[PDB]
């Protein structure tokens, strides 16, 4: 009865509490995101700061069981889920003043507007109507405008916030013994005494640079074609041996180069895949769509969907006036009650979000027999990348015309093959320098080795050295480009996106062995083989129990 | 003849709570056992001491019903031998059991849109059950070493909680009525068993 029983009771009391206010307050969002009305957003509400209070109240209660003395794992690991302040170690003035300036920010990047110079009276917002211009435009001197008002006009409001902003997140990391914020973010990656699984969180550094010294070979010959095939599209501006204008690249900032697709297609007149006619024409609907990825899951030994989820998904848009916010997700209020959220359309697009948000479905139906506070990913990027393998294979054409999309025959050549990989180097490929840059600038911003009067001079020094792209007019210290960012001003963790990039093909590496598949990794399917899937569960049902460094190890090795 | 009361325990509007849960006796009367098939939902019909081979040409001195509410995925807890929260501080089984038990979802009846907080059960013990013993007191359970004199706070805990049915839950977290048949052959020659074919 000395520390650990009561702990262990304690835990149970949590365990049985908050698993049903959490079922109340994920239901009433659910219903409020299905059927947008006005009570609605007083019950979300009326749950979401129930359960948070109740959370905070039990913060406190709980920093009374020292976790020096505490001996098993698994109540170790939640107390200390459990125990960490967070916010709320600052002072009231000074809290109040944080939570003011986020609030700046994010209002500020989603309502703020730039015109014309001509018609003062035409002024565009970011979303419908500025990376529309960024995606779709060929005019160099239109872009320019829009990439350049968009940070001289918005921007300059964010720095007086995000230098302020800074200070308060670097004491309220302190004041947990961090050092730092970014030491703070880096502190989901640490593993602590299992002896043969460590993971200090300086280490993540030190792994990060080394797996980006690898891909610079690739992303050189990636980078160089692009720049050789827009030398066609905007002649007398690309220099064959600089970097690229920033304002080319597709998007106002550059993290996906998906869009110079059109100008960069190897075999432009080799249309790849697509079934979108082929799929109305045998007359699918969404209810045939979840049927075929539920028959894919449960052909490598995944169980059924729980019958309920036939019942309360909402697969298709609600008709008349159900104003609903059509962005699809999955959801897990708990208790063996799964639903879906989206606006199918027969198309091919939706038949590949099928499958992620069915994996993801997978993903929880998985772990549903863990504590309440260990339920989740071991990790924060291994949910999507589980999520993309799903999708990675469901779109192979050895896959669609064994579900029957496609001619019996389809011979296929190695020229489809290229326009393919391409199309996929773009997505994946193009977006990790970015990432990685951006992420090590808010890490040596947070630690100080940057002065705030050197800001800028950093950002575009890293950008041509790291990411290869140039900047179309120069930029003073009034400016800030980062923070022009949904990530940056909205205060999200960026390397997520790096190490779930990696993972993803990692698992696609081991469970292809695991199938027996002998040509390329890119025609890799893992239907119909079981051993595939006892791999995959040995992980997906551990949930945050075991370090990432174990989980990761029962599947790649 | 007499018949057995199976329709009058077997379909009680409102069946109790596990920790105090219900115990009615049957006398000395004809024990009619194919017919408790009428609805027969059901969800297990296993039986430990009889085989399903004398469902009636044995008979026993009294048996008693026991009727209560639990969660799906615990009934697996009730035998002889199990442990878990219903094995050790709401329910025991002896190991010489001789009776069987039986199950049915009841998620259309008991579950409430807005949580039907009226079923309890007991998560907290000083130690574990009996069999067939029956325990109700509502003291204020003691964590630590400090005692609490009786009010609710740091480790010391009310030993009660509540299951929250609702209609939108899944298998094993639904109401599920369950009824203990256990039979008793002490020394009586003649007592309530099955009918004969005439
Ligand atoms: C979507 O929400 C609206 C408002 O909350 C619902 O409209 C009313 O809901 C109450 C709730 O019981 C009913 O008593 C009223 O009859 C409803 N009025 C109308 C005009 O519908 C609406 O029912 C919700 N959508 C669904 C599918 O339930
Ligand atoms: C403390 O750790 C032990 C093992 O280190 C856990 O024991 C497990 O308990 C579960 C049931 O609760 C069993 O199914 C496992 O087989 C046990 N593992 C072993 C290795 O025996 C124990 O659960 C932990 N404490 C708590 C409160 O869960
Ligand atoms: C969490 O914050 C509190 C302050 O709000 C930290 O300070 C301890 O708080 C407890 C509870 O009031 C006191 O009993 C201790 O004396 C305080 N000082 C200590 C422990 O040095 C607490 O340390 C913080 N805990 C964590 C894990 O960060
Ligand atoms: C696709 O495959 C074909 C056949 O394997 C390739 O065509 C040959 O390419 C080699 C490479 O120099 C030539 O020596 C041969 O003369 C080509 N064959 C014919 C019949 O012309 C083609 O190059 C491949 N293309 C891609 C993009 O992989
Ligand atoms: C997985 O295996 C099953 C059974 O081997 C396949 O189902 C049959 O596949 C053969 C081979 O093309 C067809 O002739 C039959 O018509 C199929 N029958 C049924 C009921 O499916 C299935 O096609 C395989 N799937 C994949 C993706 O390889
Ligand atoms: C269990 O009790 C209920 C309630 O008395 C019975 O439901 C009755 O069913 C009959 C015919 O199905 C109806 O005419 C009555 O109106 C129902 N009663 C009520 C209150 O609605 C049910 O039939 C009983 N089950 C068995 C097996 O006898
Ligand atoms: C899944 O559901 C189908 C019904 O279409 C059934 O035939 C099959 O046995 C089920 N499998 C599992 C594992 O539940
Ligand atoms: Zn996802």
Redesign the pocket.
């Given at each position: 009865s000395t520390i650990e029983e009561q702990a262990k009771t304690f835990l149970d009391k949590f365990n049985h509490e908050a698993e049903d206010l959490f079922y109340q307050s994920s239901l009433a969002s659910w219903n409020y995101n299905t059927n947008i009305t006005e009570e609605n957003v007083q019950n979300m509400n009326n749950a979401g700061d129930k359960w948070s209070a109740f959370l905070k109240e039990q913060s406190t209660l709980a920093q009374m069981y020292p976790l020096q003395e505490i001996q098993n794992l698994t109540v170790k690991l939640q107390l200390q889920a459990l125990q960490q302040n967070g916010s709320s170690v600052l002072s009231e003035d000074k809290s109040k003043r944080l939570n003011t300036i986020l609030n700046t920010m994010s209002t500020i990047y989603s309502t703020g507007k730039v015109c014309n110079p001509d018609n003062p009276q035409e002024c565009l917002l970011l979303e419908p109507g500025l990376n529309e211009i960024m995606a779709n435009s060929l005019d160099y001197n239109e872009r320019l405008w829009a990439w350049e008002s968009w940070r001289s006009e918005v921007g300059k409001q964010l720095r007086p916030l995000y230098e302020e902003y800074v200070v308060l997140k670097n004491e309220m990391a302190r004041a947990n013994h961090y050092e730092d914020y970014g030491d703070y973010w880096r502190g989901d990656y640490e593993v602590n005494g299992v002896d043969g699984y460590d993971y200090s969180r300086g280490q993540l550094i030190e792994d990060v640079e080394h797996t980006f010294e690898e891909i610079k070979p690739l992303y050189e010959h990636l980078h160089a074609y692009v720049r050789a095939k827009l030398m066609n599209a905007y002649p007398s501006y690309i220099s064959p041996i600089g970097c690229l204008p920033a304002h080319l690249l597709g998007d106002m900032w550059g993290r996906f180069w998906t869009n110079l697709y059109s100008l960069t297609v190897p075999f432009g007149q080799k249309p790849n895949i697509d079934v979108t006619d082929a799929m109305v024409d045998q007359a699918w609907d969404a209810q045939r769509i979840f049927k075929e990825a539920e028959k894919?899951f449960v052909?490598v030994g995944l169980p059924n969907m729980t019958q309920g989820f036939w019942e309360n998904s909402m697969l298709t848009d609600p008709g008349n006036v159900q104003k609903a916010v059509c962005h699809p997700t999955a959801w897990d209020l708990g208790k063996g009650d799964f639903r879906i959220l989206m606006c199918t359309k027969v198309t091919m697009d939706d038949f590949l979000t099928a499958h992620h948000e069915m994996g993801h479905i997978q993903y929880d139906m998985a772990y549903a027999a863990q504590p309440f506070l260990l339920r989740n990913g071991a990790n924060e990027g291994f949910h999507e990348a589980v999520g993309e393998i799903m999708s990675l294979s469901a779109a192979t054409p050895?896959?669609l015309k064994?579900?029957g999309l496609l001619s019996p025959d389809f011979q296929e050549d190695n020229e489809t093959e290229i326009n393919f990989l391409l199309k996929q180097a773009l997505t994946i490929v193009g977006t990790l320098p970015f990432t990685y840059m951006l992420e090590k600038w808010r890490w040596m911003v947070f630690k100080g080795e940057i002065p705030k009067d050197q800001w800028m001079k950093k950002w575009w020094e890293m950008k041509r050295e790291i990411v290869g792209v140039v900047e179309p007019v120069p930029h003073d210290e009034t400016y800030c480009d980062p923070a022009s960012l949904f990530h940056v001003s909205n205060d999200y963790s960026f390397i997520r996106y790096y190490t779930r990039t990696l993972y993803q093909f990692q698992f696609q590496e081991a469970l292809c062995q695991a199938a027996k598949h002998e040509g390329p990794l890119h025609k890799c399917?893992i239907?119909?083989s079981t051993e595939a899937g006892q791999k995959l569960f040995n992980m997906l049902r551990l949930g945050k129990s075991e370090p990432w460094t174990l989980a990761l190890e029962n599947v790649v090795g | 003849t007499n018949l057995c009361p199976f329709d009058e325990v077997f379909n009680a509007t409102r069946f109790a709570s596990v920790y105090a849960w219900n115990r009615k006796r049957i006398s000395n009367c004809v024990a009619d056992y194919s017919v408790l098939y009428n609805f027969a939902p059901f969800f297990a019909f296993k039986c430990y001491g009889v085989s399903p081979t004398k469902l009636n040409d044995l008979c026993f001195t009294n048996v008693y019903a026991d009727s209560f509410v639990i969660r799906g995925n615990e009934v697996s807890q009730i035998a002889p031998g199990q442990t878990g929260n219903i094995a050790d501080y709401n329910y025991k089984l002896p190991d010489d059991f001789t009776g069987c038990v039986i199950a049915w979802n009841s998620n259309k009846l008991d579950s409430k849109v807005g949580g039907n907080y009226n079923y309890r059960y007991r998560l907290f013990r000083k130690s574990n059950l009996k069999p067939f013993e029956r325990d109700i007191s509502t003291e204020i359970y003691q964590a630590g070493n400090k005692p609490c004199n009786g009010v609710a706070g740091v480790n010391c805990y009310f030993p009660l909680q509540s299951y929250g049915f609702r209609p939108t839950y899944g298998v094993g977290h639904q109401p599920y009525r369950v009824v203990v048949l256990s039979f008793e052959l002490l020394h009586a020659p003649a007592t309530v068993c099955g009918p004969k074919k005439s």
């Open positions: 894919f052909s050895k896959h064994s579900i399917d239907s119909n | -």
